[PDB]
Design a protein around this ligand. Structure first.
Ligand SMILES: CC[C@@H](Oc1cccc(CN(CCCOc2ccc(OC)cc2)c2nc3ccccc3o2)c1)C(=O)O
Lengths: 277, 10
């Protein structure tokens, strides 16, 4: 039997602290994204990019953060899109880095271990967060300003047509778990503090933090999902699938590296991918 | 190293 005791009371306090900083660290939460995806709100009405003609009109009507009418952009839509993803990822690395610092105990870790946890955690977290902005038809982009269809992304020339499909495939399965931001906040915090990343030097303080987080997550799941036992175990197993898509995505990234002109990867992304998996 | 990542942590 579960019981309300000082231990669980602190577990709830931790869960609320993560949620609060999770909301401050990340702009478009799953709660806001779901409302947009169903029109069940305002602001909203994102421009839908579903064919090449609507892509052109979308680039004109959407205010992409990486815009600037002065910069030179590729002539291929597939590369312009790839660049947008690069920009968003770089932003996500900073949002995730900020969120990590808000995790009780993280800043007091070996700074070089903090780097290793961020290095391996960002992309697993990116694909977790990316699912919040996905349904089976497409994906929210530009902080909800736009919506780009799944089939349009598949229609991009090789090898870019295969870039996002694995992510949609993962998101469908992952979103069936029906997690909310409160569950997500702890889950990604558990990911960042995987004490089994290669290269860690001071592993004990990491596993001690992750165990505290795994307790808070399990309590969160039981309290928040009465109609689904085993949610905790299913969720842990989804990290495994995340490490695989990150691996599958590194391989895809090498095809595009030795096939496209220069295809400059942002230096931050290069640090992350250098000597990864 | 991961100079950028290091910078961000600081
Ligand atoms: C490129 C190298 C990069 O690969 C990837 C792989 C998967 C996803 C991304 C980025 N991504 C998709 C947004 C695209 O947004 C546009 C922008 C402009 C545009 O032009 C029309 C088209 C689409 C994203 N969504 C997020 C939601 C929440 C948190 C983080 C998020 O990250 C990059 C890597 O390896 O890091």
């Amino acid at each position: 039997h579960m019981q309300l005791n000082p231990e669980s009371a602190d577990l709830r306090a931790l869960a609320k602290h993560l949620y609060d900083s999770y909301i401050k660290s990340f702009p478009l939460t799953k709660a806001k994204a779901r409302a947009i995806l169903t029109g069940k709100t305002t602001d909203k009405s994102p421009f839908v990019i579903y064919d090449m003609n609507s892509l052109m009109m979308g680039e004109d009507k959407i205010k992409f953060k990486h815009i600037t009418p002065l910069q030179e952009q590729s002539k291929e839509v597939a590369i312009r899109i790839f660049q947008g993803c690069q920009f968003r990822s770089v932003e996500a690395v900073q949002e995730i880095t900020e969120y990590a610092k808000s995790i009780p105990g993280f800043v007091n870790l070996d700074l070089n271990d903090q780097v290793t946890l961020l290095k391996y955690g960002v992309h697993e977290i990116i694909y977790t967060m990316l699912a919040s902005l996905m349904n089976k038809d497409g994906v929210l982009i530009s902080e909800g300003q736009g919506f780009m269809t799944r089939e349009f992304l598949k229609s991009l020339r090789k090898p870019f047509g295969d870039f996002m499909e694995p992510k949609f495939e993962f998101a469908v399965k992952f979103n069936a778990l029906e997690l909310d931001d409160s569950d997500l906040a702890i889950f990604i915090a558990v990911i960042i503090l995987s004490g089994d990343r290669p290269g860690l030097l001071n592993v004990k303080p990491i596993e001690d933090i992750q165990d505290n987080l795994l307790q808070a997550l399990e309590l969160q799941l039981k309290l928040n999902h009465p109609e689904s036992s085993q949610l905790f175990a299913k969720l842990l197993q989804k990290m495994t699938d995340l490490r695989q898509i990150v691996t599958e995505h590194v391989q895809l990234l090498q095809v595009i590296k030795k096939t496209e002109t220069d295809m400059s990867l942002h230096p931050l992304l290069q640090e992350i991918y250098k000597d990864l998996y | 190293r991961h100079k950028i990542l290091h910078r961000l942590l600081q």
